[PDB]
From a paper:
Here we report the refined single-particle cryo-electron microscopy (cryo-EM) structure of the inactivated mature TBEV vaccine strain Sofjin–Chumakov (Far-Eastern subtype) at a resolution of 3.0 Å. A clear electron density was observed for the E protein ectodomain shell showing the arrangement of antiparallel dimers on the surface of the virion into the common “herringbone” pattern with icosahedral symmetry (residues 1–396). Residues 14–18 (domain I) were not resolved in two of three independent subunits. We also did not observe electron density for any parts of the M protein as well as for stem and anchor regions of E protein, in contrast to the previously published TBEV structures. The absence of electron density below the E protein ectodomain shell in our structure of inactivated TBEV suggests that formaldehyde linking likely causes rigidification of the ectodomains, which start to act as a sort of “hull,” while membrane-associated domains become less ordered. Thus two types of dimers are present: symmetric dimer formed by twofold icosahedral axis-related subunits, and asymmetric dimer formed by E3 and E5 subunits. We calculated the volume and surface area for these cavities for E5–E3 dimers in all the three TBEV structures, as well as for Zika virus and Japanese encephalitis virus. iTBEV had the smallest surface area and volume for both cavities compared to those in TBEV-Kuutsalo and TBEV-Hypr, consistent with the largest buried surface area between the subunits. Thus one may suggest that all the major structural epitopes should be conserved in the vaccine particles and not destroyed by the formaldehyde inactivation. Our structure directly confirms this hypothesis: for all the previously described complexes of TBEV envelope proteins with antibodies, resolved by different methods (X-ray crystallography or cryo-EM), the epitope structure is reproduced by our data, meaning that formaldehyde inactivation is soft enough and suitable for the virus structure studies in general. While intact TBEV conformationally rearranges at pH 6.0 and decreases its ability to bind mAbs, inactivated TBEV binds them with the same efficiency at pH 6.0 and 7.8, suggesting that its conformation is not dependent on the pH due to formaldehyde-induced cross-linking of the envelope proteins.
Residue numbers in the entry:
A (entry chain B): 51 to 99
B (entry chain C): 51 to 149
C (entry chain C): 199 to 297
D (entry chain A): 1 to 13, 19 to 396
E (entry chain A): 348 to 396
F (entry chain B): 150 to 198
G (entry chain B): 298 to 347
Amino acid sequence: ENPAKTREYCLHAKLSDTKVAARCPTMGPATLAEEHQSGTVCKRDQSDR
Amino acid sequence: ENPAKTREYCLHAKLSDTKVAARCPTMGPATLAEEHQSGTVCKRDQSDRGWGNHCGLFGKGSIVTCVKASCEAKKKATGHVYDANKIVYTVKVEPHTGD
Amino acid sequence: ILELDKTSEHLPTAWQVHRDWFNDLALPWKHEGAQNWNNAERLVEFGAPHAVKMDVYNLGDHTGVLLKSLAGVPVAHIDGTKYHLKSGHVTCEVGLEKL
Amino acid sequence: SRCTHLENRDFVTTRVTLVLELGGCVTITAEGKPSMDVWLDSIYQENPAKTREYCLHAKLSDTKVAARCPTMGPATLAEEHQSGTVCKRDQSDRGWGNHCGLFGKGSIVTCVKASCEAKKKATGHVYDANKIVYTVKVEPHTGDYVAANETHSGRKTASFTVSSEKTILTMGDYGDVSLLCRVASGVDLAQTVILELDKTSEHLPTAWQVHRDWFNDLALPWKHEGAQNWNNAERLVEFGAPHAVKMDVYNLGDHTGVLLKSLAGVPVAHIDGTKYHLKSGHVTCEVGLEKLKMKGLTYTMCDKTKFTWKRIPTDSGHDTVVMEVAFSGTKPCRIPVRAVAHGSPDVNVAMLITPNPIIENNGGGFIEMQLPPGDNIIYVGELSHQWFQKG
Amino acid sequence: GSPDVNVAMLITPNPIIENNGGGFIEMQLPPGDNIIYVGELSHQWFQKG
Amino acid sequence: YVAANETHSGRKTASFTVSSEKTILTMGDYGDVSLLCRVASGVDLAQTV
Amino acid sequence: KMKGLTYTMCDKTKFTWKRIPTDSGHDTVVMEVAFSGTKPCRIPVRAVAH
Ligand SMILES: *[C@@H]1O[C@H](CO)[C@@H](O)[C@H](O)[C@H]1NC(C)=O
Ligand SMILES: *[C@@H]1O[C@H](CO)[C@@H](O)[C@H](O)[C@H]1NC(C)=O
């Protein structure tokens, strides 16, 4: 009767509120407040400017 | 004049808001909202638990601790970098007179 | 140009330091206008877990660690906004033919 | 049982010799005597004797410079004699335009009054084998369970020192136990300094158990207790290269982090006001069970039908099973506890670490036992529980 | 010598006072100088050898 | 400086009998000092009249 | 405990010999100075080998 739940997995993500920030070739790292929040995925990358 | 600030370093941390959460050996990971806030340091580890450790089972329980960590006032080492398009060399000349 | 507290009465205003070595300083760091320190872990130790404790320890002021690694290093003067090298050189041609 | 609270434990079978350690516990057992949990609770001293103070951050003030032209002999200051000054004597390239009459190496001297900055001291203390106290604790291994943050009302304490003597503790109803701990067989205290910093630092250890020679070997400015000036104050001051009639004095900054970085692989030590505690150390101690008594051997067995589990049989993580039962009456009772293998169909194999388990009004429900490997059934009257034992 | 170790090897073991009794004590001691104590009573003792 | 016929204020006196242990003398502003003189290892009284 | 480690140095100009440096008969030198200020002080004593 009612065995204990271990890990849940997610099969299909729901994505909302995309944001972008960028900087010029010597202004160091671009940043967003959403890098320091729960429930966000972020990527940091380099772009030819 | 005013060469570009590069990376600042912090020489002395100001540590605050040490928060702990822990769980019994079956219940998986302990958690804090700190772990996701800005300006925190955290560690996750395993702590021995048992009966009387106010816990059901003898084993290792997940523990997480997080400390809020700003820089101490005026304890910064700032770097600056020169620009070949704004640097000035100064050359001086004097006539080798009898003065 | 490495710069600490400009108001330090018993230190150089700055030091002329190598770019790779500066990027190898083992401390928490951030860029100009960034709000919070990268690698804040570097100034915090966690004491081995005890039941529902893990011990947050501030690893102290690293200023003297830096100054030992800056012993004998070339100074740089800072005349307000002007950041001056105190070692280095330039190549010139001097025209004597109209003296 | 306090010895269930620790993952370091041992078991021993009328007098017995033990080694008792900080961060260790022994469940003593004997035929027809109640078992006892015994540990070294603390090693400490009230206000141990100071050794050397060190300064971690110098304070420099009243800088003075004097210089002399290339042949007028050595420059001098009265401050080169005075106590609590750091000085450097050097040569300066002088000439005309520095307003000498001549070109060559002048003499320059610079001196500064060099104290130590407020609370920036590392202080050593050392233990005395004739004033150090070893606290040993004992509790009767009754059928009562208390948390780590609870206290067996039967928990009893003995303090050992070179002047202390073979001590008898009355274990309440469980008779009495005789204890003789040889403090001279314990820690080699001469090899240790209790290194201390600012005690008030919220995010640091109160002290460190450093080696004796290492504390004498530190390259810092230093003094013995109550002296008003610092030996070797050069160790926090650099002097610049001289320029004409000037030389710069550089304060080498706070060495607190330099020391803390070097305190790697070093055991912490605890300070409780005036009490300075070690957190590693041990004593050879001799225990006697001759006057211990089992409670309630005259009681009836409790009614086998009237038990319930309060804590189902659970592995302690030692080789022992632990459990707690609740009985519906309030009767003083023996508990009918047994265990039988899935093998020999009726032979009892419950090797109790809690011998002669008994219930009393508001006590006695807890039991600890060792078992043989493979499947068993544990029984506590009409309570039963199958048990696979590891092997 | 040893500044606090008790060396009073009592021939009268567990000495006790009672109303109108118990004041007498006999002991063996190690050779050389000692101090005997009976509370705040003290007495230096050179033992023969 | 006081002459041999003159008393120094901080002169402090301890009278070692056989009934005597480590004795504390308060040296005014100079703190405390303590003495234990071992009277049975002084003069050989049995040989002396 | 040392008395007076905390006191200021006395004014170097205000000393006079009351008993000039004298050989004690032991290996030591003894002397006594009179100081004309009223102050509690440390004495700025030193000696220099040629
Ligand atoms: C012991 O600690 C536990 C921690 O969960 C707490 O629930 C319990 O009330 C404590 N007992 C007492 C009275 O200190
Ligand atoms: C000691 O003798 C001297 C003379 O030699 C005398 O002047 C002095 O009063 C005597 N007593 C004291 C207390 O100095």
